[PDB]
Amino acid sequence: VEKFNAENYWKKKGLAMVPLKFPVGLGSRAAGQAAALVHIYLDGSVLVT
Amino acid sequence: MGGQEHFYMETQSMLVVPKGEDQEMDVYVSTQFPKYIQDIVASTLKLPA
């Protein structure tokens, strides 16, 4: 890229790298609770919600 | 001893609605046995319960 920019005046290339720390959390326990409901019918099939 | 008609004032009544996805079926029916309606409808359609 430095070689390209030394050889082109009206066109320029650029390059960059950034790191990532994305923390995950909601600030309270109650805000992270979850629930489900599962049925098994007598033919063996399952319904989940 | 002779027989007897039930003579429920509401005659046999049902509305069967397909959802349009995954061959899902919703059956609204005047019945005493929803589990049995589910079994015979699923069997007739070759579907899991």
Coordinates of all heavy atoms in Angstrom, one line a residue:
Chain A
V1 N 0.8 -1.2 0.0 CA 0.0 0.0 0.0 C 0.9 1.3 0.0 O 0.6 2.2 -0.7 CB -1.0 0.0 1.2 CG1 -1.7 1.3 1.3 CG2 -2.0 -1.2 1.0
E2 N 1.9 1.3 0.8 CA 2.9 2.4 0.8 C 3.5 2.5 -0.6 O 3.8 3.6 -1.1 CB 3.9 2.2 1.8 CG 3.5 2.5 3.3 CD 4.2 1.7 4.3 OE1 4.7 0.6 4.0 OE2 4.3 2.2 5.5
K3 N 3.8 1.4 -1.3 CA 4.3 1.4 -2.6 C 3.3 2.0 -3.6 O 3.7 2.7 -4.5 CB 4.8 0.0 -3.0 CG 5.9 -0.1 -4.0 CD 5.7 -1.2 -5.0 CE 6.9 -1.3 -6.0 NZ 6.7 -0.3 -7.1
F4 N 2.0 1.6 -3.5 CA 1.0 2.1 -4.4 C 0.8 3.6 -4.2 O 0.6 4.4 -5.1 CB -0.3 1.4 -4.1 CG -1.4 1.8 -5.0 CD1 -1.6 1.1 -6.2 CD2 -2.3 2.9 -4.7 CE1 -2.7 1.5 -7.1 CE2 -3.3 3.2 -5.6 CZ -3.5 2.5 -6.7
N5 N 0.9 4.1 -2.9 CA 0.7 5.5 -2.7 C 1.9 6.4 -3.1 O 1.7 7.5 -3.4 CB 0.4 5.8 -1.2 CG -0.9 5.2 -0.7 OD1 -1.9 5.0 -1.5 ND2 -1.1 4.9 0.5
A6 N 3.0 5.7 -3.2 CA 4.2 6.4 -3.7 C 4.2 6.6 -5.2 O 4.9 7.4 -5.8 CB 5.5 5.7 -3.3
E7 N 3.3 5.8 -5.9 CA 3.3 5.7 -7.3 C 2.0 6.3 -7.9 O 1.8 6.3 -9.1 CB 3.5 4.3 -7.8 CG 4.9 3.8 -7.6 CD 5.0 2.3 -7.8 OE1 4.0 1.6 -8.1 OE2 6.1 1.8 -7.7
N8 N 1.0 6.7 -7.1 CA -0.3 7.2 -7.5 C -0.6 8.5 -6.7 O -0.4 8.5 -5.5 CB -1.4 6.2 -7.3 CG -1.2 4.9 -8.2 OD1 -1.8 4.8 -9.2 ND2 -0.3 4.1 -7.7
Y9 N -1.0 9.5 -7.4 CA -1.2 10.8 -6.7 C -2.7 11.1 -6.5 O -3.1 11.6 -5.5 CB -0.6 12.0 -7.6 CG -0.6 13.3 -6.9 CD1 0.5 13.7 -6.2 CD2 -1.7 14.2 -7.0 CE1 0.5 14.9 -5.5 CE2 -1.7 15.4 -6.3 CZ -0.5 15.8 -5.6 OH -0.5 17.0 -5.0
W10 N -3.6 10.8 -7.5 CA -5.0 11.0 -7.4 C -5.8 9.8 -7.0 O -7.0 9.8 -7.0 CB -5.5 11.5 -8.8 CG -4.8 12.8 -9.3 CD1 -3.9 12.8 -10.3 CD2 -4.9 14.1 -8.7 NE1 -3.5 14.1 -10.4 CE2 -4.1 14.9 -9.5 CE3 -5.7 14.6 -7.7 CZ2 -4.0 16.3 -9.2 CZ3 -5.5 16.0 -7.4 CH2 -4.7 16.8 -8.2
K11 N -5.1 8.7 -6.7 CA -5.7 7.5 -6.2 C -4.8 7.0 -5.0 O -3.6 6.9 -5.1 CB -5.8 6.4 -7.2 CG -6.8 6.7 -8.3 CD -8.1 5.9 -8.0 CE -9.3 6.4 -8.8 NZ -8.9 6.8 -10.2
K12 N -5.4 6.6 -3.9 CA -4.7 6.2 -2.7 C -5.3 4.9 -2.1 O -6.6 4.8 -2.2 CB -4.7 7.3 -1.6 CG -4.0 8.6 -2.1 CD -2.4 8.3 -2.0 CE -1.7 9.5 -2.7 NZ -0.3 9.3 -2.7
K13 N -4.5 4.0 -1.6 CA -4.9 2.9 -0.9 C -4.7 3.0 0.6 O -3.8 3.8 1.0 CB -4.2 1.6 -1.4 CG -4.8 1.1 -2.7 CD -4.2 -0.3 -3.1 CE -4.5 -0.6 -4.6 NZ -3.9 -1.9 -5.0
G14 N -5.5 2.4 1.4 CA -5.4 2.4 2.8 C -5.7 1.1 3.5 O -6.3 0.2 2.9
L15 N -5.1 0.9 4.7 CA -5.2 -0.4 5.3 C -5.2 -0.2 6.8 O -4.5 0.8 7.3 CB -3.9 -1.2 4.9 CG -3.7 -2.6 5.5 CD1 -4.5 -3.7 4.8 CD2 -2.2 -2.9 5.5
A16 N -5.9 -1.0 7.5 CA -6.1 -0.8 9.0 C -6.6 -2.1 9.6 O -7.3 -2.9 9.0 CB -7.1 0.3 9.3
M17 N -6.3 -2.3 10.9 CA -6.8 -3.4 11.7 C -7.1 -3.0 13.0 O -6.4 -2.2 13.7 CB -5.7 -4.6 11.8 CG -6.1 -5.6 12.8 SD -4.9 -7.0 12.9 CE -4.5 -7.2 11.1
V18 N -8.3 -3.4 13.5 CA -8.8 -3.0 14.8 C -9.1 -4.3 15.6 O -9.5 -5.3 15.1 CB -10.1 -2.1 14.7 CG1 -9.7 -0.8 13.9 CG2 -11.2 -2.8 14.1
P19 N -9.0 -4.2 17.0 CA -9.3 -5.4 17.8 C -10.7 -5.3 18.4 O -11.3 -4.2 18.3 CB -8.2 -5.3 18.9 CG -8.0 -3.9 19.1 CD -8.2 -3.2 17.7
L20 N -11.1 -6.3 19.1 CA -12.5 -6.4 19.6 C -12.5 -7.0 20.9 O -12.0 -8.2 21.1 CB -13.4 -7.2 18.6 CG -14.9 -7.4 19.0 CD1 -15.6 -6.0 18.9 CD2 -15.6 -8.4 18.2
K21 N -13.2 -6.3 21.9 CA -13.6 -6.9 23.2 C -15.0 -6.5 23.4 O -15.3 -5.4 23.8 CB -12.7 -6.6 24.3 CG -13.2 -7.2 25.7 CD -12.5 -6.8 26.9 CE -13.0 -5.4 27.4 NZ -14.2 -5.5 28.2
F22 N -16.0 -7.3 23.0 CA -17.4 -7.0 23.2 C -17.9 -7.8 24.4 O -18.1 -9.0 24.3 CB -18.2 -7.4 21.9 CG -19.7 -7.0 22.0 CD1 -20.1 -5.7 21.7 CD2 -20.6 -7.9 22.4 CE1 -21.4 -5.4 21.8 CE2 -22.0 -7.6 22.5 CZ -22.3 -6.3 22.2
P23 N -18.1 -7.2 25.5 CA -18.6 -7.9 26.7 C -20.1 -8.1 26.6 O -20.9 -7.3 26.0 CB -18.3 -7.0 27.9 CG -18.2 -5.6 27.3 CD -17.7 -5.8 25.9
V24 N -20.6 -9.2 27.2 CA -22.0 -9.7 27.2 C -22.5 -9.8 28.6 O -21.9 -10.5 29.4 CB -22.1 -11.0 26.4 CG1 -23.5 -11.4 26.4 CG2 -21.6 -10.8 25.0
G25 N -23.6 -9.1 28.9 CA -24.2 -9.1 30.2 C -25.2 -8.0 30.3 O -25.1 -7.0 29.7
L26 N -26.2 -8.2 31.2 CA -27.4 -7.4 31.2 C -27.5 -6.5 32.4 O -28.5 -5.7 32.5 CB -28.7 -8.2 31.1 CG -28.9 -8.9 29.7 CD1 -29.5 -10.3 29.9 CD2 -29.8 -8.0 28.8
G27 N -26.6 -6.6 33.4 CA -26.6 -5.7 34.6 C -27.5 -6.3 35.7 O -27.3 -5.7 36.9
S28 N -28.3 -7.3 35.5 CA -29.1 -7.9 36.6 C -29.4 -9.3 36.3 O -29.5 -9.7 35.1 CB -30.3 -7.1 36.9 OG -31.3 -7.3 35.9
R29 N -29.6 -10.1 37.3 CA -29.9 -11.5 37.1 C -31.3 -11.7 36.5 O -31.6 -12.5 35.6 CB -29.8 -12.3 38.4 CG -29.7 -13.8 38.2 CD -29.8 -14.6 39.5 NE -29.5 -16.0 39.4 CZ -29.5 -16.9 40.4 NH1 -29.7 -16.5 41.6 NH2 -29.3 -18.1 40.1
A30 N -32.3 -10.9 37.0 CA -33.7 -11.1 36.6 C -33.8 -10.7 35.1 O -34.7 -11.3 34.4 CB -34.6 -10.2 37.4
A31 N -33.0 -9.8 34.6 CA -33.0 -9.5 33.2 C -32.6 -10.6 32.2 O -32.8 -10.5 31.0 CB -32.2 -8.2 32.9
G32 N -31.9 -11.6 32.8 CA -31.5 -12.7 32.0 C -32.2 -14.0 32.1 O -31.7 -15.1 31.6
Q33 N -33.3 -14.0 32.8 CA -34.1 -15.3 33.0 C -34.9 -15.6 31.8 O -35.2 -14.7 31.0 CB -35.0 -15.2 34.2 CG -36.2 -14.2 34.1 CD -37.0 -14.0 35.3 OE1 -37.7 -14.9 35.7 NE2 -36.8 -12.9 36.0
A34 N -35.1 -16.9 31.6 CA -35.7 -17.4 30.4 C -36.5 -18.7 30.7 O -36.2 -19.4 31.7 CB -34.8 -17.7 29.2
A35 N -37.5 -19.0 29.9 CA -38.4 -20.1 30.2 C -38.8 -20.7 28.9 O -38.8 -20.1 27.8 CB -39.7 -19.7 31.0
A36 N -39.3 -22.0 29.0 CA -39.7 -22.8 27.8 C -40.8 -23.7 28.3 O -41.1 -23.9 29.5 CB -38.5 -23.5 27.2
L37 N -41.5 -24.3 27.3 CA -42.5 -25.3 27.5 C -42.3 -26.4 26.4 O -42.3 -26.1 25.2 CB -43.9 -24.7 27.4 CG -45.1 -25.6 27.7 CD1 -45.1 -26.0 29.2 CD2 -46.4 -24.9 27.3
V38 N -42.2 -27.7 26.9 CA -42.0 -28.8 26.0 C -43.1 -29.8 26.2 O -43.3 -30.2 27.4 CB -40.6 -29.4 26.2 CG1 -40.4 -30.6 25.2 CG2 -39.5 -28.3 26.0
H39 N -43.7 -30.3 25.1 CA -44.7 -31.4 25.2 C -44.1 -32.6 24.4 O -43.5 -32.4 23.3 CB -46.0 -31.0 24.5 CG -46.6 -29.8 25.1 ND1 -46.6 -29.5 26.5 CD2 -47.3 -28.8 24.5 CE1 -47.3 -28.4 26.7 NE2 -47.7 -27.9 25.5
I40 N -44.3 -33.8 24.9 CA -44.1 -35.0 24.2 C -45.5 -35.7 24.0 O -46.1 -36.0 25.0 CB -43.1 -36.0 24.9 CG1 -41.8 -35.3 25.2 CG2 -42.9 -37.2 24.0 CD1 -40.8 -36.2 25.8
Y41 N -45.9 -35.9 22.7 CA -47.1 -36.5 22.4 C -46.9 -38.0 22.3 O -45.8 -38.5 22.2 CB -47.7 -35.9 21.1 CG -48.1 -34.5 21.3 CD1 -47.2 -33.5 20.8 CD2 -49.2 -34.1 21.9 CE1 -47.5 -32.1 20.9 CE2 -49.6 -32.7 22.0 CZ -48.7 -31.8 21.5 OH -49.0 -30.4 21.6
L42 N -48.0 -38.8 22.4 CA -48.0 -40.2 22.5 C -47.4 -40.9 21.2 O -47.1 -42.1 21.3 CB -49.3 -40.8 22.9 CG -49.9 -40.3 24.2 CD1 -51.0 -41.2 24.7 CD2 -48.8 -40.1 25.2
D43 N -47.4 -40.2 20.1 CA -46.7 -40.7 18.9 C -45.2 -40.5 19.0 O -44.4 -40.9 18.1 CB -47.2 -40.2 17.6 CG -46.9 -38.7 17.4 OD1 -46.4 -38.0 18.3 OD2 -47.1 -38.3 16.3
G44 N -44.7 -39.8 20.0 CA -43.3 -39.6 20.2 C -42.8 -38.2 19.7 O -41.7 -37.8 20.0
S45 N -43.6 -37.5 18.9 CA -43.2 -36.2 18.4 C -43.2 -35.1 19.6 O -43.9 -35.3 20.6 CB -44.1 -35.8 17.3 OG -45.4 -35.5 17.7
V46 N -42.5 -34.1 19.3 CA -42.3 -33.0 20.4 C -42.6 -31.7 19.8 O -42.4 -31.3 18.7 CB -40.8 -33.1 20.8 CG1 -40.5 -32.0 21.8 CG2 -40.4 -34.4 21.4
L47 N -43.3 -30.9 20.7 CA -43.6 -29.5 20.5 C -42.8 -28.7 21.5 O -43.0 -28.9 22.7 CB -45.1 -29.2 20.5 CG -45.5 -27.8 20.0 CD1 -45.3 -27.6 18.5 CD2 -46.9 -27.4 20.4
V48 N -42.0 -27.7 21.1 CA -41.3 -26.8 22.0 C -41.6 -25.4 21.7 O -41.8 -25.0 20.5 CB -39.7 -27.1 21.8 CG1 -39.3 -26.8 20.4 CG2 -39.0 -26.2 22.9
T49 N -41.7 -24.6 22.8 CA -41.9 -23.1 22.7 C -41.1 -22.5 23.8 O -40.8 -23.1 24.8 CB -43.3 -22.7 22.7 OG1 -43.4 -21.3 22.5 CG2 -43.9 -23.1 24.1
Chain B
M1 N -85.7 -52.5 25.9 CA -85.5 -51.1 26.2 C -84.9 -50.4 24.9 O -83.9 -50.8 24.4 CB -84.5 -50.9 27.4 CG -84.5 -49.5 27.9 SD -83.3 -49.4 29.2 CE -83.1 -47.6 29.3
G2 N -85.6 -49.4 24.4 CA -85.2 -48.7 23.3 C -84.0 -47.8 23.5 O -83.6 -47.6 24.6
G3 N -83.5 -47.2 22.4 CA -82.3 -46.4 22.4 C -82.7 -44.9 22.8 O -83.7 -44.7 23.5
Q4 N -81.8 -44.0 22.4 CA -82.0 -42.6 22.7 C -81.1 -41.7 21.9 O -79.9 -42.0 21.7 CB -81.8 -42.3 24.2 CG -82.2 -41.0 24.7 CD -81.9 -40.8 26.2 OE1 -81.1 -41.4 26.8 NE2 -82.7 -39.8 26.8
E5 N -81.6 -40.7 21.3 CA -80.7 -39.7 20.7 C -80.2 -38.7 21.7 O -80.9 -38.4 22.7 CB -81.5 -38.9 19.6 CG -82.0 -39.7 18.4 CD -80.9 -40.2 17.5 OE1 -79.7 -39.8 17.7 OE2 -81.1 -40.9 16.5
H6 N -78.9 -38.3 21.5 CA -78.3 -37.4 22.5 C -79.1 -36.1 22.4 O -79.4 -35.5 23.5 CB -76.8 -37.1 22.1 CG -76.0 -38.4 22.0 ND1 -75.9 -39.1 20.9 CD2 -75.3 -39.0 23.0 CE1 -75.1 -40.2 21.1 NE2 -74.7 -40.1 22.4
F7 N -79.4 -35.6 21.2 CA -80.1 -34.3 21.0 C -79.5 -33.2 21.8 O -80.1 -32.4 22.5 CB -81.6 -34.4 21.4 CG -82.5 -33.7 20.4 CD1 -83.2 -34.4 19.5 CD2 -82.6 -32.3 20.4 CE1 -84.0 -33.8 18.5 CE2 -83.4 -31.7 19.5 CZ -84.1 -32.4 18.5
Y8 N -78.1 -33.1 21.7 CA -77.4 -31.9 22.0 C -78.0 -30.8 21.1 O -78.3 -31.0 20.0 CB -75.9 -32.1 21.8 CG -75.6 -33.0 20.7 CD1 -75.9 -32.8 19.3 CD2 -74.9 -34.2 20.9 CE1 -75.6 -33.6 18.3 CE2 -74.6 -35.1 19.9 CZ -75.0 -34.8 18.6 OH -74.7 -35.7 17.6
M9 N -78.2 -29.6 21.7 CA -78.8 -28.5 20.9 C -77.9 -28.0 19.8 O -78.4 -27.5 18.8 CB -79.3 -27.4 21.9 CG -80.7 -26.8 21.5 SD -82.0 -28.0 21.5 CE -81.6 -29.0 22.9
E10 N -76.6 -28.0 20.1 CA -75.6 -27.7 19.0 C -75.3 -29.0 18.2 O -74.8 -30.0 18.8 CB -74.3 -27.1 19.6 CG -73.2 -26.9 18.6 CD -71.9 -26.6 19.3 OE1 -71.6 -27.3 20.2 OE2 -71.2 -25.7 18.8
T11 N -75.6 -29.0 16.9 CA -75.2 -30.1 16.1 C -73.7 -30.2 15.9 O -73.0 -29.3 16.3 CB -76.0 -30.1 14.8 OG1 -75.6 -28.9 14.1 CG2 -77.5 -30.0 15.0
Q12 N -73.3 -31.3 15.3 CA -71.9 -31.5 15.0 C -71.3 -30.3 14.2 O -71.9 -29.9 13.2 CB -71.7 -32.8 14.2 CG -72.1 -34.0 15.0 CD -71.1 -34.5 16.0 OE1 -70.0 -34.1 16.0 NE2 -71.6 -35.3 17.0
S13 N -70.3 -29.7 14.7 CA -69.7 -28.4 14.1 C -68.2 -28.4 14.2 O -67.7 -28.7 15.3 CB -70.4 -27.2 14.8 OG -71.8 -27.3 14.8
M14 N -67.6 -28.0 13.1 CA -66.1 -27.9 13.2 C -65.6 -27.0 12.1 O -66.3 -26.8 11.0 CB -65.5 -29.3 13.0 CG -66.1 -30.2 12.0 SD -65.5 -31.9 12.1 CE -66.7 -32.6 13.2
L15 N -64.4 -26.4 12.3 CA -63.7 -25.6 11.3 C -62.3 -26.0 11.3 O -61.6 -26.0 12.4 CB -63.9 -24.1 11.7 CG -63.2 -23.1 10.8 CD1 -63.6 -23.2 9.4 CD2 -63.4 -21.6 11.4
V16 N -61.8 -26.4 10.2 CA -60.4 -26.9 10.0 C -59.7 -25.9 9.2 O -60.0 -25.6 8.0 CB -60.4 -28.3 9.4 CG1 -59.0 -28.7 9.1 CG2 -61.1 -29.3 10.3
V17 N -58.6 -25.3 9.8 CA -57.8 -24.2 9.1 C -56.4 -24.7 8.9 O -55.7 -24.9 9.9 CB -57.9 -22.9 9.9 CG1 -57.2 -21.8 9.2 CG2 -59.4 -22.6 10.2
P18 N -55.9 -24.8 7.7 CA -54.4 -25.0 7.5 C -53.7 -23.7 7.6 O -54.2 -22.6 7.2 CB -54.3 -25.6 6.1 CG -55.6 -25.2 5.4 CD -56.7 -25.0 6.5
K19 N -52.5 -23.8 8.2 CA -51.7 -22.6 8.5 C -51.0 -22.1 7.3 O -50.8 -20.9 7.1 CB -50.7 -22.9 9.7 CG -49.7 -21.8 9.9 CD -50.4 -20.5 10.4 CE -51.0 -20.6 11.8 NZ -51.7 -19.4 12.2
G20 N -50.5 -23.0 6.4 CA -49.7 -22.6 5.3 C -48.2 -22.9 5.4 O -47.5 -22.6 4.5
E21 N -47.8 -23.4 6.6 CA -46.4 -23.7 6.9 C -46.3 -25.1 7.5 O -47.1 -25.5 8.4 CB -45.8 -22.7 7.9 CG -45.6 -21.3 7.4 CD -44.9 -20.4 8.4 OE1 -44.1 -21.0 9.2 OE2 -45.2 -19.2 8.4
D22 N -45.4 -25.9 7.0 CA -45.0 -27.2 7.6 C -46.3 -28.1 7.7 O -46.3 -29.0 8.6 CB -44.4 -27.0 8.9 CG -43.1 -26.2 8.8 OD1 -42.5 -26.2 7.7 OD2 -42.6 -25.6 9.8
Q23 N -47.3 -27.9 6.9 CA -48.5 -28.7 6.9 C -49.2 -28.6 8.3 O -49.9 -29.5 8.7 CB -48.3 -30.1 6.5 CG -48.2 -30.3 5.0 CD -47.8 -31.8 4.6 OE1 -46.7 -32.2 4.9 NE2 -48.7 -32.5 4.0
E24 N -49.0 -27.5 9.0 CA -49.6 -27.3 10.3 C -51.1 -27.2 10.1 O -51.6 -26.6 9.1 CB -49.1 -26.1 11.0 CG -47.7 -26.2 11.5 CD -47.3 -25.0 12.3 OE1 -48.2 -24.2 12.8 OE2 -46.1 -24.7 12.6
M25 N -51.9 -27.8 11.0 CA -53.3 -27.8 11.0 C -53.9 -27.4 12.3 O -53.5 -27.9 13.4 CB -53.9 -29.2 10.6 CG -54.1 -29.4 9.1 SD -55.6 -28.6 8.6 CE -55.8 -29.2 7.0
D26 N -54.8 -26.4 12.3 CA -55.6 -26.0 13.5 C -57.0 -26.5 13.3 O -57.7 -26.2 12.3 CB -55.5 -24.5 13.6 CG -54.3 -24.0 14.3 OD1 -53.9 -24.6 15.4 OD2 -53.6 -23.1 13.8
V27 N -57.5 -27.3 14.3 CA -58.8 -27.9 14.2 C -59.7 -27.3 15.3 O -59.4 -27.6 16.5 CB -58.8 -29.4 14.2 CG1 -60.2 -30.0 14.3 CG2 -58.0 -30.0 13.1
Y28 N -60.7 -26.5 15.0 CA -61.7 -26.1 15.9 C -63.0 -26.9 15.8 O -63.6 -26.9 14.7 CB -62.0 -24.6 15.7 CG -60.7 -23.8 15.6 CD1 -60.2 -23.5 14.3 CD2 -60.1 -23.3 16.7 CE1 -59.0 -22.7 14.2 CE2 -58.9 -22.5 16.6 CZ -58.4 -22.3 15.4 OH -57.2 -21.5 15.3
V29 N -63.3 -27.6 16.8 CA -64.4 -28.7 16.7 C -65.1 -28.8 18.0 O -64.5 -28.6 19.1 CB -63.8 -30.0 16.3 CG1 -62.6 -30.4 17.1 CG2 -64.8 -31.1 16.3
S30 N -66.4 -29.0 18.0 CA -67.2 -29.2 19.1 C -67.1 -30.7 19.5 O -67.8 -31.6 19.0 CB -68.7 -28.9 18.9 OG -69.4 -28.9 20.1
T31 N -66.1 -31.0 20.4 CA -65.8 -32.4 20.7 C -65.6 -32.6 22.2 O -65.3 -31.6 23.0 CB -64.5 -32.9 20.0 OG1 -64.3 -34.2 20.3 CG2 -63.3 -32.0 20.3
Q32 N -65.6 -33.8 22.7 CA -65.3 -34.2 24.0 C -63.9 -34.7 24.2 O -63.5 -35.1 25.3 CB -66.3 -35.3 24.5 CG -67.7 -34.8 24.8 CD -68.7 -36.0 24.9 OE1 -69.3 -36.4 24.0 NE2 -68.8 -36.5 26.2
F33 N -63.1 -34.8 23.1 CA -61.9 -35.6 23.1 C -60.9 -35.0 22.1 O -60.7 -35.5 21.0 CB -62.2 -37.0 22.8 CG -61.1 -38.0 23.3 CD1 -61.3 -39.4 23.2 CD2 -60.0 -37.6 23.9 CE1 -60.4 -40.3 23.7 CE2 -59.0 -38.5 24.4 CZ -59.3 -39.8 24.3
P34 N -60.3 -33.8 22.5 CA -59.4 -33.2 21.5 C -58.2 -34.0 21.2 O -57.7 -33.9 20.1 CB -58.9 -31.9 22.3 CG -60.0 -31.6 23.3 CD -60.5 -33.0 23.7
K35 N -57.7 -34.8 22.1 CA -56.5 -35.7 21.8 C -56.9 -36.7 20.7 O -56.0 -37.0 19.9 CB -56.1 -36.5 23.1 CG -54.8 -37.1 23.0 CD -54.9 -38.6 22.8 CE -53.5 -39.3 22.6 NZ -53.6 -40.8 22.5
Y36 N -58.1 -37.2 20.7 CA -58.5 -38.2 19.7 C -58.7 -37.5 18.3 O -58.3 -38.1 17.3 CB -59.8 -38.9 20.1 CG -60.6 -39.5 18.9 CD1 -60.1 -40.5 18.2 CD2 -61.8 -39.0 18.6 CE1 -60.8 -41.1 17.1 CE2 -62.5 -39.5 17.5 CZ -62.0 -40.6 16.8 OH -62.7 -41.1 15.8
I37 N -59.2 -36.3 18.3 CA -59.3 -35.5 17.1 C -57.9 -35.3 16.5 O -57.7 -35.4 15.3 CB -60.0 -34.2 17.3 CG1 -61.4 -34.4 18.0 CG2 -60.2 -33.4 16.0 CD1 -62.3 -35.3 17.2
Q38 N -56.9 -35.0 17.4 CA -55.6 -34.8 17.0 C -55.0 -36.0 16.4 O -54.3 -36.0 15.3 CB -54.7 -34.3 18.1 CG -53.3 -34.1 17.8 CD -52.5 -33.7 19.1 OE1 -52.9 -34.0 20.2 NE2 -51.3 -33.1 18.9
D39 N -55.3 -37.2 17.0 CA -54.7 -38.4 16.5 C -55.2 -38.8 15.1 O -54.5 -39.1 14.2 CB -55.0 -39.6 17.5 CG -54.2 -39.4 18.8 OD1 -53.4 -38.5 18.9 OD2 -54.4 -40.3 19.7
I40 N -56.6 -38.8 14.9 CA -57.2 -39.2 13.7 C -56.9 -38.2 12.6 O -56.8 -38.6 11.4 CB -58.7 -39.5 13.9 CG1 -59.2 -40.4 12.8 CG2 -59.5 -38.2 14.1 CD1 -60.7 -40.6 12.8
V41 N -56.8 -36.9 12.9 CA -56.5 -36.0 11.8 C -55.1 -36.1 11.4 O -54.8 -36.1 10.2 CB -56.8 -34.5 12.3 CG1 -56.2 -33.5 11.4 CG2 -58.3 -34.3 12.4
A42 N -54.1 -36.2 12.3 CA -52.7 -36.4 12.0 C -52.5 -37.7 11.2 O -51.8 -37.7 10.2 CB -51.9 -36.4 13.3
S43 N -53.2 -38.8 11.7 CA -53.0 -40.1 11.0 C -53.5 -40.0 9.5 O -52.9 -40.4 8.6 CB -53.8 -41.1 11.7 OG -54.0 -42.3 10.9
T44 N -54.7 -39.3 9.3 CA -55.3 -39.2 8.0 C -54.4 -38.3 7.1 O -54.3 -38.6 5.9 CB -56.7 -38.5 8.1 OG1 -57.5 -39.3 9.1 CG2 -57.4 -38.5 6.8
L45 N -53.7 -37.3 7.7 CA -52.8 -36.5 6.9 C -51.4 -37.0 6.9 O -50.5 -36.4 6.2 CB -52.8 -35.1 7.5 CG -54.2 -34.3 7.4 CD1 -54.1 -33.0 8.1 CD2 -54.6 -34.2 5.9
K46 N -51.1 -38.1 7.5 CA -49.8 -38.7 7.6 C -48.8 -37.8 8.2 O -47.6 -37.6 7.7 CB -49.3 -39.2 6.2 CG -49.6 -40.6 5.8 CD -50.0 -40.7 4.4 CE -50.1 -42.2 4.0 NZ -49.1 -43.0 4.6
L47 N -49.2 -37.1 9.3 CA -48.4 -36.1 10.0 C -48.1 -36.5 11.4 O -48.9 -37.2 12.0 CB -49.1 -34.7 9.9 CG -49.3 -34.1 8.6 CD1 -50.1 -32.8 8.7 CD2 -47.9 -33.7 8.0
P48 N -47.0 -36.0 12.0 CA -46.8 -36.1 13.4 C -47.8 -35.3 14.2 O -48.4 -34.3 13.7 CB -45.4 -35.6 13.6 CG -44.7 -35.7 12.3 CD -45.8 -35.5 11.3
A49 N -48.1 -35.7 15.4 CA -49.1 -35.0 16.2 C -48.7 -33.5 16.5 O -49.6 -32.7 16.8 CB -49.3 -35.7 17.6

